[model samples]
Target: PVKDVELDGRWDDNCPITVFTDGYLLTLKNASPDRDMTIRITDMAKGGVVYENDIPEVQSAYITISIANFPAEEYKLEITGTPSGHLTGYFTKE
Candidate 1:
């Protein structure tokens, strides 16, 4: 299924060093009820968005952000939140 994600600020320490997909899961360290989270995955080769999504209401601290159908390669993952500093990281998709 096609989807969308959010992006902002550059890659930061908030994300993983590398992501092994089998489950492209976005695991939050904690829950923020007043916060809104978003994600964006960009293709390293063409610098295009391979995947993205926007979660206006963060209902779960740990949830599955699907990327099972995406290619296995290095991708730039960006995480953005409402009224919060954004995060980004380059992760290897396996």
Candidate 2:
């Protein structure tokens, strides 16, 4: 079943990273509600950075990546600042 999740600053076992398609929406919920955050996307295989963005201090935020044109491979999503964590997932283009 396809679903969505909201994440705060703390690490939670309830959040299980899953494979997602291109443009999948990831919403990050700010725990502090007034601290800016940084988002980083990397190519795990190549060990190179792909994309980076700054999330202004807020209650919530969303991020989507275009993996459609990317080579079928694994990637990493890192969110830092108010909430800091890593998401290990993959992108398979059909």
Candidate 3:
């Protein structure tokens, strides 16, 4: 369970990337201990989304998003808490 969150709608990057370019493969690992987790991307501001992935209940797994051709900008990760979870995030896409 998410004990505390930083903001209303923000995904704490499993690993945050400051810049995106071609041949860049972005992956997000789920930190849930009980079951698998899924992350959804919303409010894309610039460039096109190369991939959106969803993972079922598991431990220490990851979601890969291809950043090839993706512009260096901001994006939002809408993390879905699994097994009676909540959603929140307020971010930018550039």
Candidate 4:
């Protein structure tokens, strides 16, 4: 599973972080009543994402992943379109 998480001022703090137990970036975007956009992931090797992937789909408010034996990694997330064109934000593991 992946660990660590942070965000940039691209969208809003409303966007949260999600990860999995296998170490691959997994999870879905939060339900935004405001926009329908395409979310992107990258830069995980340098610190951008908090959780990787374990499941196929993530639909909830609080994310739950197994990060007991996983090393900390970083991943990048970018959202575009449905929300408002394309936007980006970065985060890292703690």
Which number leads on lDDT? 1
Worst 10 residues of 3 by lDDT: 13-22
Model 3, range 10-89, lDDT digits (tens) per residue?
Answer: 33423221222224554444444444455555545653443455566554355555544545555565555545443444
**Against the unseen true structure, what C-alpha lDDT does each candidate score?**
0.57, 0.50, 0.44, 0.42
In candidate 4, what are the lDDT values of residues 30-86, reduced to their tens digit?
Answer: 554344444555556654443333222233333343434335555466544433344
By TM-score, how accurate is candidate 1?
0.61
What does the lDDT come to for candidate 2?
0.50
Off by over 4 Å in 1: 1-29
The segments of candidate 3 whose C-alpha lies over 4 angstroms from its true place after superposition are 1-23, 46-51, 86-94
Locate the minimum summed-lDDT window of 10 residues in model 4: 53-62
- Estimate TM-scores for all models: 0.61, 0.53, 0.45, 0.36
Cα lDDT over the full model 4: 0.42
The sequence of per-residue lDDT tens digits that candidate 1 reaches over residues 19-89 is 23345654444334446667678989889997777766555255455656678877888767666646666
Q: Over the stretch 1-94, how does candidate 2's per-residue lDDT look in tens digits?
A: 4333323344342443222342544344433344465667677678777778876755334445555555555656666654454443333333
